[PDB]
């Protein structure tokens, strides 16, 4: 997952997670503008290994972190499924479930044929269930940090984003809390490229300066 | 600044980052506070704001306010920092009687030789012939009143011998109409000049509170006589018709084809210069 | 047949303006597009269609108005090639 | 407008433009989470000059700006009951506007007579004439520094919002934008407070030191 | 349009408007069962010349004729096209048209200009004033023989049905109603199937006897 | 090969007007005539001299200047229609 | 004619509360605006469109509906005066006026 | 000086409707006629009277309270019409005029 643009001399790569610090203040607002409007503008350019030109609905764009809306349709269905999934995996679990289950629909049906109408139904499963449950993400309570980290968690979920960027995300957390976000980027194996005026320091990063040079930096 | 704005359309003006914003319906323009000089509105549905007007007291731009008969009514005032303008009424409040009766007579030279000539372009020969031996007759003080003269042999040339400018009609009526546009434009260009309009060059006659603009509209007074000779048969509706149409039509400057505003502007920039510098050159206007 | 129509006038007065303004909707609205300024062009079906058009157009055109009409075949209509934008001394700064 | 946490010692006032920085990494996130959680949380509160509570309803919270759309639902219903509202205020225009829509509405109703299937319709109001023409304010912004702008002027439009707030908004523009930002907002009066991790060098801010002791600079 | 069921010998081929009378009430409610539940059963077999048999989805069934919603998002969709059309089709309308909406977007361009507000539109169009008027077609005080002649004029509107049948609505309208609505079927070239239990006296008609033989009848 | 050339390009601008006479110049100097207002056209001797006419017009495009280039026939070139901006007799018929 | 619209109907059922919504909907729709509660006014261009809004009027009046109105000058509208338990200020003959603050 | 007079107030609570009637009693000893619910008019000698009718019924008006104060004329007031959904006769072009018995 290569990016590239005007002022760089050549296309740079950005694997698991990336910390780029642009320190003058007209490349960084002209590339976050060509973020927004990545679509329309030919200027910064964000190719796979295939070099195929990623389409700006699978570029996947946060500024406002608390703002994102992390509950959706598409990544609570896929977490219901998920959920399934776990609870498939065990088998003992699997089984009292289907007791209980059992039970509740031989106490509902007997109700049903107490009826006076002839009553039929299917069953009640455990996406249903989860579904009546109404299992979802709370960020109502959440600290900026966890917020951030819930988003790393639920990027694996979003199929169609194919790379996570962050713009000036890294000014809220602290030195330690950065060091927890790409240890777990690593573990993620996500794609993510944070985007920050001023350099933050102890953590690997790579810095544009005002000459429109760009160097890797340890600290 | 150099350019000066001005606003003949309805249209809002905003402040923006040291950058004036103007929004008209067909299009929004952006423009430098340097780069405006004088600004005017000429209509009255135009919209500005206070800030705007902050912004154009800290750049000193004059801002001229104009009513529906497009006359100029008033003018912002600041308490410091004032325009030049004001700096430059003193000049006028200096005019010499000898520089006054010299633009005066080029003036009233001026009017009566286009006379002359529209009545030679009408193939008049007598008639224009007269006018010209007024024109070669005129002289300072104006003791023989040959404008006066002229004037009725011009009338009763164009209309008729029955027509007269006392008479009440549908001619003399456009007549004032078309002196009213004209008086309209030439005093809006003295009010840009930012001299008062309230001192005439005419020294006998101070009724008249636009006796500067309508001694500087005298020259081209006879542009009107033609479209009312031309359309004097129409209505006085399609008589305004017909002068509304002056503005859209160009006419000849001595230097190039021009726009009637630029010659305008032009030649009452060159009489406040030369009435400033006591008579550098007098700017002679021809049909 | 492909029509290239060339569209100019003195843009000066307001009711010049005015016109521009409504003669390109009108060309807008009778199928033309717009590769630039004053630069437009139409797919017309046959003879009949491109003359009622050179009428219509003659009879919309505003005043002081001046079209140029250029037939074109359609593959040469493709091949219209539009490009957008020898010096001693290049300078890269301010031009002085 | 005043603003007042646990960790001030008196309540600040922010009057026109306002910077406030946050030295502290943990008070700037943890106040940010006030922020947004304002509704939820009573630790962060907001005085005005009578001294009187406001609801979040009323606070306008603005992080990302290219990412806050200036065309809402709420925004377009107040500029459509605005236009409807000057329209209804000159009684002639509003006359005429009805007479072609009477006529257009008959050119129609002929044509649906000439058909031959039966027609049934209603009538043709303004609102449906102002919905139907796409009113709504400019979307076109070239740079951060323009859309911000916009984002003052339909604050300054809208009267519910009594105080606008941006978190690290001034990293994007230069210093002479953040000069013609700030005297933009002195010039429209609105009520704008910022909040910056860090101190900007050339402007008036109140640093908020990590001793939790605020002082004004500049 | 040639429909076939078991019962008959040939293939029947359905032209313009078609009266089918089944004398038994057996093979009669079976027969509508079947075309109810089309779509499983196997046993009535309906196909065009190219022999390919048609989906559900192409058939038009209706039994209840005021019961039925002729407006719809497509036909309402449709006919607005059609009217657009209709105005289209004459220079001078148009004209008149464009003139009044170009002096009212004046009217209303010049109120945003009046506004402090930077305003944008882009155009009132023909399809968005019909669509602003609410044409639509009025059910609600119709006689049944106008229901059923709306059902006939919106059939053409219909594309993804490719038969309309129609079933024991043949005993509401008059002969002279019936003769008006097959006169209409033969100009409007759709394909109707009529479905009753009694013969009607006076029109072309395939009659089905108790016997199961299937007889033309001039009368 | 005819070739019609449309040059456009807002004016508003000092430097962008120099930029248009110098263009302009530039498209005389090769031989172009120009018809009308942004309307141009030059005739080319084969499909080597059109390329070599095709890259040198891409050169020297000024800044933000827009051309549309057009092949035409001459039959087609002769069936050029310009109108600048109502009979009381139609004749439907021989012409007489 | 300046057109002065009071408007007062029992509101205890939910069809009067349904009906009284329509109804100042409907005042709303034809150009009427609301003072205040029960309050309404509209610029009629002559006498004739008067007529029309007086027929409209009792047309579109609800069950239990009563609408008094009155007919007023510029000059008489320009004097009316709202006191809510705070009078307007435009029957104040007071010489200074601030829209602002009063300090 | 016609002053008409309209009255409105949240009448749920009993204090306020203990002081809806007592300002309603108010405006009747002070020369003031019902035409209808909320509504009432008083004939005022000139513009003193009014003054001090004005500050009286500031003075008096109940807390929630809400008056609005119009001026006009009588041939204004003979104008007024007042439609019940049956309206006031005045507004009516009739040209026989039974006040008896309608037959
Ligand atoms: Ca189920
Ligand atoms: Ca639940
Ligand atoms: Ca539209
Ligand atoms: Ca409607």
Same mark, same amino acid.
């Given at each position: ?5 005007? *002022? ?14 642009? %320190?003058? =203040? ?5 590339? =976050? ?25 699978? *570029? ?13 349709? !598409? =990544? ?15 088998? %003992? =679990? ?88 790409? %240890?777990?980027?690593?573990?993620? !194996?996500?794609?993510? *490229?944070?985007? %920050? ?23 | ?47 500005? /704001? ?27 005032? +600041? ?16 005019? #010499? ?28 020969? &007598? ?5 010209? &031996? ?8 104006? +003791? ?19 027509? /007269? ?23 809006? &260009? ?28 005298? +020259? ?29 039509? /160009? ?21 406040? #210069? ?8 007098? +700017?002679?206007?021809?049909? | ?33 717009? @590769? ?10 046959? @003879? ?49």
């Amino acid at each position: 997952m290569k990016i590239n643009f005007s *002022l760089l001399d050549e296309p740079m790569e950005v694997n698991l997670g990336t910390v780029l610090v642009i %320190e003058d =203040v007209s490349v960084f607002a002209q590339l =976050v503008k060509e973020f927004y409007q990545y679509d329309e503008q030919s200027n910064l350019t964000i190719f796979d290994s295939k070099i195929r030109s990623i389409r700006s609905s699978e *570029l996947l764009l946060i500024t406002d972190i608390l703002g994102y809306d992390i509950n959706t349709s !598409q =990544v609570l269905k896929l977490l219901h499924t998920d959920i399934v999934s776990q609870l498939n995996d065990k088998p %003992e =679990v699997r089984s009292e479930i289907d007791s209980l289950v059992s039970l509740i629909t031989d106490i509902i049906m007997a109700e049903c044929i107490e009826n006076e109408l002839d009553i039929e139904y299917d069953e009640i499963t455990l996406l249903e269930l989860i579904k009546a449950l109404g299992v979802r993400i709370e960020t109502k309570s959440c600290t900026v940090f966890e917020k951030i980290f819930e988003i790393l968690q639920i990027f694996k979920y979003l199929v169609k984003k194919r790379i996570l960027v962050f713009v000036n995300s890294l000014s809220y957390f602290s030195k330690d809390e950065i060091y927890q976000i790409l %240890e777990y980027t690593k573990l993620s !194996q996500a794609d993510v *490229l944070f985007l %920050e005026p001023r350099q933050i320091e102890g953590i690997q990063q790579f810095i544009l300066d005002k000459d429109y040079i760009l160097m890797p930096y340890n600290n | 600044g150099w350019r000066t704005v001005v606003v003949n359309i309805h249209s809002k003006l905003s402040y923006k980052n040291n950058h004036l914003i103007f929004r008209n319906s067909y299009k929004t323009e952006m423009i430098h506070l340097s780069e405006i000089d004088i600004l005017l509105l000429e209509t009255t549905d135009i919209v500005l /704001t206070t800030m705007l007007v902050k912004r154009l007291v800290d750049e000193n731009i004059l801002v001229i306010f104009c009513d529906d008969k497009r006359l100029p009514t008033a003018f912002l005032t +600041p308490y410091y920092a004032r325009h030049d303008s004001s700096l430059q009424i003193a000049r006028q409040i200096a005019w #010499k009687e000898n520089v006054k009766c010299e633009v005066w007579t080029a003036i009233i030279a001026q009017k009566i030789l286009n006379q002359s000539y529209y009545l030679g372009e009408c193939s008049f020969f &007598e008639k224009s012939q007269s006018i010209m &031996e007024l024109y070669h007759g005129l002289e300072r003080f104006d +003791p023989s009143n040959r404008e006066g003269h002229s004037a009725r042999i011009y009338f009763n040339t164009l209309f008729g011998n029955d027509f /007269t400018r006392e008479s009440d009609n549908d001619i003399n009526a456009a007549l004032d109409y078309g002196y009213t546009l004209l008086l309209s434009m030439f005093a809006r &260009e003295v009010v840009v000049c930012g001299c008062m309009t309230q001192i005439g060059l005419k020294h006998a006659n101070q009724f008249n509170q636009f006796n500067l603009a309508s001694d500087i509209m005298e +020259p081209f007074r006879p542009i009107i006589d033609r479209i009312v000779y031309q359309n004097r048969h129409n209505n006085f509706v399609k008589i305004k018709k017909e002068l509304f149409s002056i503005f859209s039509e /160009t006419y000849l400057y001595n230097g190039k084809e021009m726009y009637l505003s630029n010659i305008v502007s032009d030649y009452t920039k060159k009489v406040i #210069k030369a009435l400033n510098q006591l008579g550098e050159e007098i +700017p002679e206007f021809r049909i | 047949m492909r029509m290239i129509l060339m569209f100019d006038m003195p843009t000066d007065t307001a009711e010049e303006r005015k016109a521009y303004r409504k003669f390109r909707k009108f060309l807008l609205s009778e199928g033309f597009i717009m @590769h630039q300024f004053s630069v437009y062009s139409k797919l017309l079906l046959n @003879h009949t269609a491109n003359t009622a058009m050179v009428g219509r157009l003659k009879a919309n055109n505003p005043k002081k108005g001046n079209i140029t009409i250029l037939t074109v075949t359609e593959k040469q209509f493709a091949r219209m090639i539009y490009l957008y934008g020898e010096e001693r001394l290049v300078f890269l700064g301010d031009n002085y």
